[PDB]
Amino acid sequence: MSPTSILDIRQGPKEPFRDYVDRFYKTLRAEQASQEVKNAMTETLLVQNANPDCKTILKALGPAATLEEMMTACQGVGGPGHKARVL
Q1: Distance between CA atoms of 8 and 42, rounded to whole angstroms?
Q2: Residues contacting 45, CB < 8 A, separation 6+
Q3: HSE-up of 68 (CA within 13 Å, CB side)?
Q4: DSSP class of residue 31?
Q5: Closest CA to 50 of 65, 80, 83, 72
Q6: Where are the residues of the annotated region Dimerization/Multimerization of capsid protein p24?
Q7: Cα 45 from Cα 39, distance rounded (Å)
Q8: What is the C-alpha to C-alpha distance for residues 71 and 87, in angstroms, rounded to an integer?
């Protein structure tokens, strides 16, 4: 509850996007509350609730680099992606 911060609950949240993001930003929000588009600069690795695009993609697309674009690229995506099954 109170002795409970992102960088101590940081397990390694690569893939449980919404399930963990709401929890992450709920504590982390002293530094970047505003869902600010530059969210590829702090320990932020996701976006509050996110959209169905980003969710379905980064669920497999956590290769420790390309996430930093994918985190927020979903905001301007204009479509459902191109991946008929995740792997």
Answers
A1: 15
A2: 13, 14, 24, 67, 71
A3: 8
A4: T
A5: 72
A6: 2-87
A7: 8
A8: 18
Beta carbons of 70 and 44 less than 8 angstroms apart: no
Place of tokens 């969210």: 39
Domain map of the chain by residue range?
A: 1-87
Cβ atoms of 43 and 75 within 8 Å: the answer is no
3-state secondary structure the chain: CCCCCHHHHCCCCCCCHHHHHHHHHHHHCCCCCCCCCCCCCCCCCCCCCCCHHHHHHHCCCCCCCCHHHHHHHCCCCCCCCCCCCCC
Query: The domain at 1-87 falls in which architecture?
Result: Orthogonal Bundle (1.10)
